[PDB]
């Protein structure tokens, strides 16, 4: 009653519940990135769909439309900041080519694994959940934390963790 | 109670309005004064905003203007002789705006004498000569003044203001009402 705090969904189910190729591809993504359920892949799917829909809407406009100049710049900035796109490519058309592993690569679980602090993505998951990982000295316990390119050099074991400077 | 709203009226299509609210105080009407001629009796009506309307039930004196001489006088009303709405109101002696009444004429005669020295100090005689130079009383007026009753038209609303004021009938309007009264 008279409460105006917003909320929304972040994922959607596939239209076809049993496609063998989709099911196999998702099980592969789960095994290789160490996910708990298909909802994580579907969350990435919704994020990618929203970004791609924005890019299509922007590309339909003439190149010097002020909305294109503003929002294309913003979306390129975000993609470069989070490492979804390589900093070399800077056109609006490269967002359309983004794939699910491109976003999954920037998860804190995958990043911790690729940085050598963990023996596997499964080790990385439990390492993050147990407060042993800090990003710029801030303990991050969320494996789905999307790491900016600027924060990649500040990922170390937490000071309070027994693997850092803690008891 | 009495309402002034349009809800009870038929639509122009002839269909019936389906009312879905009770009647409001802000659209009320009140019972008419039906002011009659007689010794003064007025009843205040508290109106919207806290202001007071004066509802006159009986009146017998009015402030009546002689427009051509640009003056006015407080005079006794003698009879109401014509009403355009219905001659039932002439019969009931009802005072409403634009009804024709007969007012006492003697004050207008006395003012006529004081202002012109005519009955139908040297400096005042100088003034009397200064006037009358382009002045000619009407025959239709002066004839009425001699018999002591002038026809006048009520200009106020006795149901609203509590006053039966008016103006003396002159000219084509006086001829119009004189024709209708014979």
């Amino acid at each position: 009653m008279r409460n105006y705090n917003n909320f929304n969904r972040v994922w959607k189910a596939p239209r076809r519940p049993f496609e063998k190729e989709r099911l196999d591809r998702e099980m592969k993504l789960c095994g290789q990135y160490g996910l708990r359920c298909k909802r994580e892949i579907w969350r990435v799917n919704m994020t990618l769909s929203k970004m791609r829909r924005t890019a299509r809407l922007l590309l339909t406009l003439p190149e010097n439309h002020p909305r294109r100049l503003l929002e294309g710049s913003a979306i390129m900035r975000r993609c470069h900041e989070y490492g979804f796109l390589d900093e070399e490519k800077d056109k609006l058309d490269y967002v359309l080519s983004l794939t699910v592993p491109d976003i999954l690569e920037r998860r804190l679980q995958t990043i911790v694994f690729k940085a050598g602090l963990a023996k596997s993505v499964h080790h990385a998951r439990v390492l993050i959940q147990q407060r042993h990982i800090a990003v710029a000295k801030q303990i991050v316990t969320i494996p789905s934390f999307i790491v900016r390119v600027s924060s990649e050099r500040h990922i170390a074991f937490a000071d309070a963790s027994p693997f850092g400077n803690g008891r | 109670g009495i309402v002034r709203s349009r809800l009870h009226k038929r639509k122009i299509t002839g269909g019936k309005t389906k009312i879905h609210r009770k009647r409001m105080k802000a659209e009320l009407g009140r019972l008419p004064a039906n002011t009659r001629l007689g010794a003064r009796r007025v009843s205040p009506v508290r109106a919207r905003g806290g202001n007071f309307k004066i509802r006159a039930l009986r009146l017998d004196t009015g402030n009546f203007a002689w427009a051509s001489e640009a003056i006015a006088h407080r005079v006794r009303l003698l009879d109401v002789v014509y009403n355009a709405t219905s001659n039932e109101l002439v019969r009931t002696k009802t005072l409403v705006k634009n009804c024709i009444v007969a007012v006492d004429a003697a004050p207008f005669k006395r003012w006529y004498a004081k202002h012109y020295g005519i009955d139908l100090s040297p400096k005042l005689q100088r003034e009397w000569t200064r006037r009358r130079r382009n002045h000619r009383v009407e025959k239709a007026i002066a004839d009425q003044l001699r018999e002591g009753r002038v026809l006048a038209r009520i200009t106020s609303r006795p149901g609203q203001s509590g006053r039966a004021d008016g103006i003396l009938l002159e000219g084509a309007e006086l001829q119009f009402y004189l024709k209708r009264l014979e």
């Binding site: 105006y4 705090n5 002020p66 100049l69 503003l70 710049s73 913003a74 | -």
Partner: protein, 260 residues
């Protein structure tokens, strides 16, 4: 009559959060319209932060510490809109209520002998009993003997301490105006032409410093000086110059990067 004001229904420029409470202080009748005002409680609590909540705001205001146009105002629901001078002598801060280029309320700091003057736009002229001409201003002031050249739409520069007229700024081509309503509120420009549409809203065609052209209804322009160079009032930082959105975003990004 409505005594309450829902927070969602309150004007957006008051910067009241939708989650902080159900209600907002309903402005009382007074000098300014409630859709075009900034209540004293809002000023003292949300804008100046001298009070942390409404109770402290009442403690501050009921003591008469806050002066509007040289008079102490003890009501947190006092309207206190455009061009008003607010003074709190105990802390020494003094300012004029203005519109910034984004159209929000701005508290432009004033010096003494600048706070003794306020500009008032004439909205009506009528004759009072005794054949006394009276000018009604946008602030609800009724000035009893204005300059005989005063017209509806002109500006009266007014000494609030002495309660006296000082000068008159007529509404003519080439004059400096500020927009007080609509999409262009807060922009400073020059009157280039005012087309008259009798029985309709007259449209004033304006031109800012950078040569950007814009228009608005004649009711929304406020003469503030003879030229954009010499204004009779101090104006907020941006000087009424609307900035490109792309340019604004880029400059903000670069400045933030420089800060880090």
């Amino acid at each position: 009559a409505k005594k309450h004001l829902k927070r969602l229904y309150a004007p957006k420029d008051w910067m009241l959060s939708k989650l902080t409470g159900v209600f907002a202080p309903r402005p009382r009748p007074g000098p300014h319209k409630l859709r075009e005002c900034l209540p004293l409680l809002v000023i003292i609590r949300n804008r100046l932060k001298y009070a942390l909540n409404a109770r402290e705001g009442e403690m501050i205001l009921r003591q008469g510490l806050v002066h509007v146009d040289n008079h102490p105002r003890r009501d947190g629901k006092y309207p206190a809109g455009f061009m008003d001078v607010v003074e709190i002598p105990k802390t020494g801060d003094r300012f004029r209520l203005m519109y910034d280029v984004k159209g929000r309320f701005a508290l432009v700091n004033l010096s003494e002998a600048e706070a003794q003057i306020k500009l008032m736009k004439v909205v009506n002229l009528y004759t009072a009993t005794g054949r006394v001409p009276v000018a009604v201003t946008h602030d609800g002031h009724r000035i009893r003997y204005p300059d005989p050249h005063t017209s509806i739409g002109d500006t009266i520069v007014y000494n609030v301490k002495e309660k006296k007229c000082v000068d008159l700024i007529k509404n003519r081509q080439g004059k400096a105006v500020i927009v007080t309503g609509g999409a262009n509120r807060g922009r400073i420009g020059e009157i280039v032409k005012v087309e008259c549409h009798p029985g309709a809203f007259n449209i004033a065609h304006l031109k800012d410093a950078s040569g950007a052209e814009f228009a608005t209804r004649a009711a929304n322009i406020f003469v503030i000086g003879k030229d954009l160079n010499n204004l009779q009032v101090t104006v907020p930082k941006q000087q009424g110059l609307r900035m490109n959105v792309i340019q604004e975003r880029e400059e903000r990004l670069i400045a933030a990067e420089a800060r880090k």
